[PDB]
Amino acid sequence: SDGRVIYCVNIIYWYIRLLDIFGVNKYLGPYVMMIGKMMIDMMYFVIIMLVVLMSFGVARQAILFPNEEPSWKLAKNIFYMPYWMIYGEVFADQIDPPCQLPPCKTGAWIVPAIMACYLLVANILLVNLLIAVFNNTFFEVKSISNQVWK
Amino acid sequence: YLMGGAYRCNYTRKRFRTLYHNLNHFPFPFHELMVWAVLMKRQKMALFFWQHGEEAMAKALVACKLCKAMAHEASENDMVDDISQELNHNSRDFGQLAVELLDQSYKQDEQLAMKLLTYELKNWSNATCLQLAVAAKHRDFIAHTCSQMLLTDMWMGRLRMRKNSGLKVILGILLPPSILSLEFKNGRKIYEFYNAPIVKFWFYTLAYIGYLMLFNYIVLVKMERWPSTQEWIVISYIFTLGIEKMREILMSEPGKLLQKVKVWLQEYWNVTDLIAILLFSVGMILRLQDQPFRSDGRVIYCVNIIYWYIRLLDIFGVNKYLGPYVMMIGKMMIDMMYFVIIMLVVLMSFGVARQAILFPNEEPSWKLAKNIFYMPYWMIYGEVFADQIDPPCQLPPCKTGAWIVPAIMACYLLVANILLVNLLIAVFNNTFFEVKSISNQVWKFQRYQLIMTFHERPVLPPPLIIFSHMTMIFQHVCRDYGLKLFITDDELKKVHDFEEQCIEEYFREKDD
Ligand SMILES: CCCCCCCC(=O)OC[C@H](COP(=O)(O)O[C@@H]1[C@H](O)[C@H](O)[C@@H](OP(=O)(O)O)[C@H](OP(=O)(O)O)[C@H]1O)OC(=O)CCCCCCC
Ligand SMILES: COCC(CCO[C@H]1CC[C@@]2(C)C(=CC[C@H]3[C@@H]4C[C@@H]5O[C@]6(CC[C@@H](C)CO6)[C@@H](C)[C@@H]5[C@@]4(C)CC[C@@H]32)C1)COC
Ligand SMILES: COCC(CCO[C@H]1CC[C@@]2(C)C(=CC[C@H]3[C@@H]4C[C@@H]5O[C@]6(CC[C@@H](C)CO6)[C@@H](C)[C@@H]5[C@@]4(C)CC[C@@H]32)C1)COC
Ligand code: NA
């Protein structure tokens, strides 16, 4: 089973290596080089989003669940839900549940406000600024990629 | 009064007062003549006097600062407003002269250009050209290549590792035996290693990372009746940071207690740090109580961990590519907040309409103010539903006019997700070049303040800075480099000859 999992991980690289074959086409090589440079730009703009996501996740996890023993599942809830939240999977019962009715945690009304601010920052500010960065640095990258491919 | 707080003119010194009370000549007459021409607002005379005599760059920077101060004073006292424009033009002319002279000097000889920017000026209240340019807020001077190289040399300290820095500093600060395998510039090696600004910065950065780690640990796990070891370490970090802030307030430039506070509450980071420290103090006080106040203190701790996570961008602002991006974020925040008002108007209209249409038998309760903002705000972030909004009304009775909600939602989604956000994308796109250039210039200007404020700090980080605070009291009862550069008379003469050669070459090249 471990060797099969190694095979399943390894098939991804042999799928990605089709771009090397694609680099012979006149129009598909420069695009791949532009992708290669925009990857560096994307990482530089992804560090800040990681910081904001970690802040929001730690705040929500600490507010909602105040009686947790130290376990490695605490390191999973910080990254998982805030990362899936910014890709359109915004929920209203999974985060800030409607607390017959269960007791309401202390300070549980701050989570929707923090989520609102976090969504506004992540989906309206950083991604639009990254779009502007990709847009205003495209001509030089295109020319350099064409020259390098030729 | 026109120059600044720390400036001291030669006229008010005791030697000149004694020489003037019983009434000679001046060693440098063109300095006083140019100051007179600047104060009397005679630009042609000042330009003529600037190119005669020594210390041309210092004279240009001093004239720029004086003209800017006079322009501000004239605009303050409701002058004809043409005098202010003329003074601003004079300041711009002198600043451009200083920049061009610096460019010519750096293009001719680099080492003498760097020596020209750091040597102490006896005639100008003992201040270097860098301090004169910074006090005049001259961003095009500090952003020049020579100034940036000089700042890099000042930031590296007494080290020579330029091929790959950062990693070696970390490896020598985590393995103190690894320090001795480092090249230096012409027992004491450890002292020179631990007093460099970059080593202090990395020490502070590692301490802040550890503090953030402990702060994250103390809030996720269950909080007991009395603080654990990590909580005590976090409280000690906060207390020592507050003491350091008070020390920085007390050791400021002015001699008045209420004026140092006003000049310290200028950067927004200081104000936010003060607010966060007060909030953490309140939360710590409420934590050492019974269960509900303990829960309130824990909530305050969560808000504080939000702030202390956000404060990592200040640390990130040292990287060459991560600072200008943060400043661009700061300006695009203003643009986004300008568009948010229109977004909010549309959202409130849709929310009120839907809430009033669907539920017509509601008593006045504060939950009515929640259903207006909540659901329409989550709707534009991809959580569009069809049963929770406009429910399919065995089957429940249909409310009057319940068919208008899907049409209003369609129009609202079309306006919010296709029009306003695309217009905001266009606004961010078409105003990016100027913001990028301004952010680069501002970051290259603020590098000097970063280097100076890490040069003045103690060696030990805030977790264990309480030792460095105690030793200051012991020295209380009892700058070779980093700020200035003291030279003999022969080197001073050589620098003066180099500067006059540079200005003559500059004028000849301009005429040609
Ligand atoms: C807490 C994280 C904070 C990190 C950010 C806050 C601290 C921070 O800023 O780090 C960056 C720091 C400075 O960069 P560093 O000096 O080592 O090296 C620079 C880098 O090589 C650039 O590519 C060069 O620009 P260019 O293209 O050749 O022209 C630049 O040349 P120059 O022109 O300037 O001479 C080089 O200086 O070192 C790191 O890169 C990785 C450190 C890993 C530390 C992370 C592991 C703890
Ligand atoms: C299931 O049972 C597990 C048990 C062992 C439990 O040990 C615990 C020790 C503390 C530890 C390692 C654990 C979970 C959360 C862990 C946090 C996640 C935080 O993340 C980081 C995330 C990123 C950082 C920037 C911030 O902090 C840590 C400071 C933080 C962190 C790594 C502190 C360490 C915590 C596990 C098994 O043994 C019998
Ligand atoms: C749970 O029981 C609560 C009860 C007290 C009930 O008092 C009610 C008095 C009217 C009041 C304050 C209440 C709920 C909706 C409130 C509206 C929300 C609107 O929003 C605003 C939103 C933004 C504005 C631009 C438009 O209007 C208000 C005009 C509107 C507003 C603030 C008017 C005031 C309303 C509460 C407890 O006491 C025993
Ligand atoms: Na979506």
From Swiss-Prot, chain A:
<feature type="transmembrane region" description="Helical; Name=4">
    <location>
        <begin position="1"/>
        <end position="22"/>
    </location>
</feature>
<comment type="function">
    <text>Constitutively active, non-selective divalent cation-conducting channel that is permeable to Ca(2+), Mn(2+), and Mg(2+), with a high permeability for Ca(2+). However, can be enhanced by increasing temperature and by ligands, including the endogenous neurosteroid pregnenolone sulfate and sphingosine-1 and suppressed by intracellular Mg(2+). Implicated in a variety of cellular processes, including insulin/peptide secretion, vascular constriction and dilation, noxious heat sensing, inflammatory and spontaneous pain sensitivity.</text>
</comment>
<feature type="binding site">
    <location>
        <position position="26"/>
    </location>
    <ligand>
        <name>1,2-dioctanoyl-sn-glycero-3-phospho-(1D-myo-inositol-4,5-bisphosphate)</name>
    </ligand>
</feature>
<feature type="topological domain" description="Cytoplasmic">
    <location>
        <begin position="23"/>
        <end position="37"/>
    </location>
</feature>
<feature type="topological domain" description="Extracellular">
    <location>
        <begin position="66"/>
        <end position="82"/>
    </location>
</feature>
<comment type="subunit">
    <text>Homotetramer. Interacts with TRPM1; the interaction results in the formation of a heteromultimeric cation channel complex that are functionally different from the homomeric channels.</text>
</comment>
<feature type="binding site">
    <location>
        <position position="27"/>
    </location>
    <ligand>
        <name>1,2-dioctanoyl-sn-glycero-3-phospho-(1D-myo-inositol-4,5-bisphosphate)</name>
    </ligand>
</feature>
<feature type="transmembrane region" description="Helical; Name=5">
    <location>
        <begin position="38"/>
        <end position="65"/>
    </location>
</feature>
<comment type="similarity">
    <text>Belongs to the transient receptor (TC 1.A.4) family. LTrpC subfamily. TRPM3 sub-subfamily.</text>
</comment>
<feature type="topological domain" description="Extracellular">
    <location>
        <begin position="100"/>
        <end position="108"/>
    </location>
</feature>
<protein>
    <recommendedName>
        <fullName>Transient receptor potential cation channel subfamily M member 3</fullName>
    </recommendedName>
</protein>
<feature type="intramembrane region" description="Pore-forming">
    <location>
        <begin position="83"/>
        <end position="99"/>
    </location>
</feature>
<feature type="transmembrane region" description="Helical; Name=6">
    <location>
        <begin position="109"/>
        <end position="134"/>
    </location>
</feature>
